[PDB]
């Protein structure tokens, strides 16, 4: 491997996935369970060859990274003010805004909307398991167009996954610390 | 695996080799019983059977008889003992008449071979036929079996009465 040199490799981390360095001490990328069956419990389709656990984990990692990046942006925003131009959003930090907004019937709306988007893109994941050429985390979302020049696309890929790992860990710290750089415990 | 098979590889017998008919536990348990224990004369088999049977027969008569006693009574024990002994006498009478009407043999495991070898052109059912080769299947064998049953029944009933008296007195 290129990290943890005293372990050769998991088994499936050949390098076909971006941002691959070989770091997987527990060998989690070799579970034979096709996690698409957590969505569609049965084979359903006779053409459902199956999805490798590594590809499902890559999709989950990309989704986690995007969620964590947006989450740290939002949590940092509400520490330095920046409230929505509307009533009922006064100042109630981030450690308490979640509960008060769950009370005020709009976190349920956010849950519904996020679930709608998640269901559509999980249908995308299921089609990938069925055998579509779509790669993990690829929703073909390039509106501004900074995704051409394949070298730039690969660099931005590795950038997104590394930034997502950093943002996951940073959000874990921020939520655990209740923020120290911009507020108090 | 299958734990039920035809008995002794004969699919036409009215029997089966179940985990109860032909289990090792069944084999050993029935081979340690007096009726089938090897090395016992018919008198010994009868004596052991009578001892056990009188021993457990005195129980119900003494406990639930017409002369019970929640405390220990010599009259209750005597009544139970007499009832058990008379029941053993009735059983011995039944054994005697059964043996009288069933067998006509004095030495088995031979007559069968003699009539399978030296021919049996007679009235049959004594020379030929002969069900069972055990020593219990003879006139002499069953007579000694009944005698042993009767004597052992008396002795076992007396022993059980003594034990009941000791348990009721010293406990």
């Amino acid at each position: 491997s290129k990290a943890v040199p005293f372990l050769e490799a998991p088994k499936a981390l050949d390098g076909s996935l971006p941002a691959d360095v070989g770091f997987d001490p527990l060998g989690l990328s070799d579970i034979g369970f096709d996690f698409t069956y957590l969505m569609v419990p049965t084979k359903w389709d006779e053409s459902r060859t199956g999805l490798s656990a590594l590809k499902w984990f890559r999709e989950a990692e990309i989704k986690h990274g995007r969620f964590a990046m947006l989450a740290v942006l939002g949590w940092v925003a509400v520490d330095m003010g920046l409230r929505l131009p509307v009533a009922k959003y006064a100042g109630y930090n981030a450690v308490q805004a979640h509960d008060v907004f769950v009370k005020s019937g709009d976190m349920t709306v956010g849950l519904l909307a996020i679930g709608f988007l998640e269901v559509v893109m999980g249908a995308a994941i299921y089609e990938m398991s069925k055998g579509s050429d779509r790669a993990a985390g690829e929703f073909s979302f390039d509106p501004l167009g900074l995704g051409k020049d394949p070298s730039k696309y690969a660099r931005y890929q590795v950038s997104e996954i590394k930034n997502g790992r950093l943002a996951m860990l940073a959000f874990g710290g921020i939520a655990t610390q209740a923020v120290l750089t911009n507020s108090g415990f | 695996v299958s734990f039920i098979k035809p008995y002794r590889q004969d699919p036409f017998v009215g029997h089966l080799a179940t985990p109860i008919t032909t289990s090792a536990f069944t084999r050993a348990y029935l081979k340690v019983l007096p009726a089938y224990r090897p090395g016992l004369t018919p008198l010994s088999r009868g004596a052991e059977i009578g001892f056990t049977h009188g021993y457990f027969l005195i129980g119900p008569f003494y406990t639930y008889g017409p002369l019970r006693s929640v405390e220990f009574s010599l009259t209750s024990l005597a009544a139970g003992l007499l009832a058990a002994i008379t029941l053993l006498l009735i059983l011995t009478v039944g054994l005697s008449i059964y043996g009288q009407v069933t067998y006509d043999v004095y030495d088995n495991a031979l007559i069968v071979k003699l009539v399978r070898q030296m021919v049996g052109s007679e009235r049959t059912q004594d020379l030929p036929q002969i069900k069972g080769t055990s020593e219990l299947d003879t006139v002499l064998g069953w007579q000694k079996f009944s005698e042993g049953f009767f004597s052992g029944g008396l002795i076992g009933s007396i022993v059980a009465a003594v034990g009941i008296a000791l348990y009721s007195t010293y406990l």
């Binding site: 269901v119 559509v120 249908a123 995308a124 089609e127 579509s132 779509r134 | -």
Partner: protein
């Protein structure tokens, strides 16, 4: 091969291009259902009926809230609560409307099943063009697209108005401001 609406999804097999408003938005593959008497024909007929019902309901709510009720009818600006005021004073009107809608819906279901069986009637077609606004082709497709888009928007709008009236117990434009 990829759906026009969702580029990360393959083209839904049963939705080629024919129906107005078709952009390939069938992430769950519901167009491939062929059971319990439900298929693409039944789904399209249900969608068109929903579109028309939502258009009528949204137009009615907006009309009553803006221009007020007709003479002799109750007011209140809450369309989800004024229904009980109409029923409290004119129950026969509500009952007759319900009976008429029931008969028309029985006819609609019979027509849907028949047209599905001996294919001669497009889904949602009831030969209702008294003013001849869609006689010629090359305008019928445009009118179908307009109807489908307006009906989907009015479906969403009418569901929103129903939920707002049930929860807030206030008018639609009252909730707006």
């Amino acid at each position: 091969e990829r759906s026009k609406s969702l580029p990360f999804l393959m083209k839904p097999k049963n939705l080629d291009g024919s129906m107005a408003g078709d952009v390939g938005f069938d992430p769950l593959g519901l167009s491939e259902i062929n059971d319990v008497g439900v298929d693409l024909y039944w789904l399209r007929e249900a969608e068109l009926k929903h579109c028309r019902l939502g258009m009528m309901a949204a137009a009615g709510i907006l009309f009553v809230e803006i221009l007020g009720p007709a003479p002799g009818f109750p007011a209140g600006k809450s369309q989800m609560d004024v229904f009980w005021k109409v029923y409290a004073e004119k129950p026969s009107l509500i009952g007759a409307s319900l009976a008429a809608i029931a008969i028309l819906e029985v006819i609609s279901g019979v027509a849907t099943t028949q047209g599905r069986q001996n294919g001669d009637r497009a889904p949602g077609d009831y030969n209702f063009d008294p003013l001849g606004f869609g006689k010629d082709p090359a305008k019928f497709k445009d009118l179908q697209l307009k109807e489908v888009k307006n009906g989907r928007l009015a479906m969403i709008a009418a569901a929103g108005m129903i939920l707002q009236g049930v929860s807030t117990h206030q008018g639609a434009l009252e909730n707006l401001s």
